[PDB]
Amino acid sequence: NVFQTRAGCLIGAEHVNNSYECDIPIGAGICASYQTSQSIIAYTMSLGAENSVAYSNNSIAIPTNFTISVTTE
């Protein structure tokens, strides 16, 4: 419940070993969020899901189907 971040001492946030998308940005990789009896947790933010691309000198992936996406800017 008392945690030394590289941004400073954080108090009242539960330090957690999981990683999630950044909810509230604290700084230097740390974020906090409200989660499940609930508490404000603090965690190192996740950059994304990890992916080993199936590369080799003679393998290619080709899409057999598509999706039309509409995205709003």
Binding site for another protein (CB under 8 A): 6-7, 22, 25, 27-29, 45, 47-73
Residue 23, judged by CB atoms within 10 A of its CB (0-12, 13-18, 19+), counts as: middle
The C-alpha atoms of residue 60 and residue 43 are separated, in whole angstroms, by 38
Least distance between another protein and beta carbon 10 (Å): 13
Least distance between another protein and beta carbon 5 (Å): 9
**What are 9's strand-pairing partners?**
4
In the bound state with another protein, the residue whose beta carbon lies nearer, of 36 and 56, is 56
In the bound state with another protein, the residue whose beta carbon lies nearer, of 26 and 41, is 26
| Encoded amino acid at 49, one letter | A
In the bound state with another protein, the residue whose beta carbon lies nearer, of 37 and 62, is 62
